[PDB]
Amino acid sequence: HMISLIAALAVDRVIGMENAMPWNLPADLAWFKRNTLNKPVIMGRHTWESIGRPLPGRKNIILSSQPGTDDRVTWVKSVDEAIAACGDVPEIMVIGGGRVYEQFLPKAQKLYLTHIDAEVEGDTHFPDYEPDDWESVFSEFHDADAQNSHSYCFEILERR
Ligand SMILES: NC(=O)c1ccc[n+]([C@@H]2O[C@H](COP(=O)([O-])OP(=O)(O)OC[C@H]3O[C@@H](n4cnc5c(N)ncnc54)[C@H](OP(=O)(O)O)[C@@H]3O)[C@@H](O)[C@H]2O)c1
Ligand SMILES: Nc1nc(=O)c2nc(CNc3ccc(C(=O)N[C@@H](CCC(=O)O)C(=O)O)cc3)cnc2[nH]1
Numbered sequence: 510h511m512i513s514l515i516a517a518l519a520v521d522r523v524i525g526m527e528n529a530m531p532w533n534l535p536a537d538l539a540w541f542k543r544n545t546l547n548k549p550v551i552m553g554r555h556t557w558e559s560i561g562r563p564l565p566g567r568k569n570i571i572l573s574s575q576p577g578t579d580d581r582v583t584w585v586k587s588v589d590e591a592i593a594a595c596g597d598v599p600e601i602m603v604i605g606g607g608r609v610y611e612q613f614l615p616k617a618q619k620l621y622l623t624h625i626d627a628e629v630e631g632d633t634h635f636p637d638y639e640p641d642d643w644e645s646v647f648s649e650f651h652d653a654d655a656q657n658s659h660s661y662c663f664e665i666l667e668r669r
Contacts, residue, residue, distance in 0.1 A: 512592070514603045514610055515544055515621040516635050517661075523631030525606055528559045531629035536657045544621050545602045549595040553609040557582070567602075570594050572609060588612050607633040614638055620666040627659045644669050 517537050518524055525531070549568040552560070557571045569582035570591050577584030585591040595601045603613040614636050620643065622635075647665040651657070 510597070510599060510601065511619065512601045512603060512613060512617045513619040513621060514605075514613060514617050515541060516605055516610060517541070517623040517625055518635045519625045519627040519629045519631070521631075522635040522637070523629050523633070524635050525559070525633035526629060526631045528555055530559070531631060532625060532627050532659060534623075534625060534657050534659060534661060536651065537623045537625070537661055537663075540621075540623065540663055541604075545604065548600055548602045549598055551591045551595070551601060551603045551609065551613070553606050556604065556606040556609070559606075568595065588616075592616075607635070611636045618668045620664075622664045622666065624662045624664060625659050626653075626661065642669055643667070 516524055517534070519532060523531065545564070546566050549570055550564060551570045551572065554571055554573040563569045563581045571577070571582050571584050572591055573584055574586060583594050585594050592601065603609060603617070643666040645664060646667050648662060650662040651660060653660050
């Protein structure tokens with residue numbers, strides 16, 4: 510199989526602020542849905558709380574060292590257990606946040622990254638990955654518009 514990370518990064522790899530997303534980009538949330546639908550998604554407990562409900566049409570797997578508090582999703586206590594709980598699927602999507610991205614990046618073969626042209630204060634960052642390890646296989650830039658207040662670029666990287 511294959512482990513992929515998907516994330517949206519503002520300037521300086523900022524991904525979060527006070528457990529929220531510090532921007533509003535519906536085209537990027539649409540890209541997120543398109544690339545995770547019908548796949549298992551692994552997330553940390555903070556990100557589970559920031560989303561606030563199960564993502565429909567996906568197997569939601571939550572990492573936490575503590576007992577689960579919601580039977581609509583699957584709770585696991587370690588990275589290996591989270592991968593196992595995904596079953597035999599072609600692609601596992603890891604959807605953050607910072608702590609969880611850092612643990613799965615060495616296992617990932619593919620990164621789905623949106624680069625957002627936005628300056629935001631953040632307390633959470635995407636991990637600092639070695640660019641030599643990754644080949645860009647897809648890149649699509651979009652200007653800001655009436656629905657998306659920042660320009661953004663969709664990128665898919667495959668591990669070399
Ligand atoms: N822009 C994006 O693409 C994106 C993606 C996701 C999230 N975010 C932002 O990221 C921020 C949250 O990221 P975060 O780094 O603060 O927290 P996180 O990684 O979402 O969750 C961290 C928690 O997950 C659990 N956990 C992680 N690894 C574990 C392991 N190996 N074994 C057991 N439990 C484990 C622990 O929960 P316990 O404390 O219960 O043990 C830990 O406290 C929020 O601001 C969110 O908005 C942005
Ligand atoms: N590219 C990317 N952008 C993000 O905003 C993102 N966010 C997370 C974590 N946070 C969230 C927050 C909300 C939703 C969400 O509501 N998605 C719904 C609505 C899709 C839409 O609005 O178009 C979904 O069904 O996927 C997903 C992830 C993880 N990876 C990401 N990856």
